[PDB]
Symmetry: C2
Subunit: 248 residues, 2 copies
């Protein structure tokens, strides 16, 4: 059974070899491939990448922050996830996308419309009816919860490993409170890119052999999504390669 992280590394390799030079908002330069998909199992393991050390504490903390509120920075002393509108559009108003996902899983697990979206908030004033940055779809199969993230653009070096962990964490959480087991996290990209100043670091990360994924234990029975605390979570068996500093 081949390590799931191999998909990520294969994507890095593919973009390095077959990717096209393309500019972005910062005119900084990237290598880009359009359209990609990776599938990561959540069954008895958690896809926190091991070919470099991923900042798990920031993942967890930023996720909890998104889940409860909140339009005010620093307070987690604009990210790659963008969950400002997950709860609101502030107490008990707008559409609560996350709670609605949870409720649908319980009232109709076969539903094909179990979807939550996130926007880049720089888009909001820019234009009428701005396209989201990320579309998140959940599916239930045989008491298993799976999640697919579609991102219109993914930063492969910095953003992607972090997002894989974020959404897998989200899935574990929702599974936990809906009484399901986590299944797969499917990661789909539009513009999948590597910034030029990340090319050398990533070429080196490619040489590294992934270690077995760790486990994620939830230590307490939680009934509501808003009740989760950082201390409710434990990462067992994370044995990663050293940190790689990617500059941005």
């Amino acid at each position: 059974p081949p390590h799931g992280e191999l998909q990520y590394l294969g994507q890095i390799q593919h973009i390095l070899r077959c990717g096209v030079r393309k500019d972005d908002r910062t005119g900084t330069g990237t290598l880009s491939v359009f359209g990609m998909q990776a599938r990561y199992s959540l069954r008895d393991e958690f896809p926190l990448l091991t070919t470099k050390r991923v900042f798990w504490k920031g993942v967890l903390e930023e996720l909890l922050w998104f889940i409860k509120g909140s339009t005010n920075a620093k307070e987690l002393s604009l990210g790659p996830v963008y969950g400002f509108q997950w709860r609101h559009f502030y107490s008990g108003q707008g559409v609560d996308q996350l709670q609605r996902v949870i409720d649908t899983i319980k009232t109709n697990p076969d539903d094909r419309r179990i979807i939550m979206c996130a926007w880049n908030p720089r888009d909001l004033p820019l234009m009428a009816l701005p396209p989201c940055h990320a579309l998140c779809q959940f599916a239930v199969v045989n008491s298993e919860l799976s999640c697919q993230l579609y991102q219109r653009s993914g930063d492969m070096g910095l953003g992607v490993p972090f997002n894989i962990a974020s959404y897998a964490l989200l899935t574990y959480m929702i599974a936990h409170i809906t009484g399901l087991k986590p299944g797969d996290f499917i990661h789909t990209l539009g513009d999948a890119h590597i910034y030029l100043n990340h090319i050398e670091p990533l070429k080196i990360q490619l040489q590294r052999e992934p270690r077995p994924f760790p486990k994620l234990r939830i230590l307490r029975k939680v009934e509501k999504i808003d009740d989760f605390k950082a201390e409710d979570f434990q990462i067992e068996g994370y044995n990663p390669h050293p940190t790689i500093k990617m500059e941005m």
Copy 2:
């Protein structure tokens, strides 16, 4: 160079072998796999499937209908594409998603937010802020136009082959008027399903060897998307296997 249709057939096979039984709105029953992606080249060929005869005339005609108007059935004497809100939300009002896609391709081809969405209109009254059925993203790379369709659910037997043709047609059109060449059509599915009464027909279609994809010639220089007519298009070299009647 392996035939692109092989991806579709591989997906059918995979769902038959490894798919899970799941009900739907009609409680009719399907085999489902969650999360799939196929990539079809549009370079000097057009992905009109050959292991059965796809209703090309309906593809073309339904697409043109979506492009100009229109909220009134029969008039193409609710589909699997769902393009009712592509132009409107009626002359010169609401947001014109399609024209905006066209304009962005011309004003900023590197843009990562070149996205159009379609809704199932049965969802519209059902709830506030309904999730779309399909998200369509365009990307430009080296004078090439590529398109990725994300569908929250795809009917593999009937809807999918038709949609592959529809969106590839759309891409050829937009390429033509933006002065680009078609690149790839990437097809991504959430719930990818086969209805149980389609299992036998599809098992038979699996045995068929695809023939080379045909070409799509555009016969006239067209400047605006609204100007395209059915007669502007020609399918050269379509040599498919016989029609398979899938009942629904």
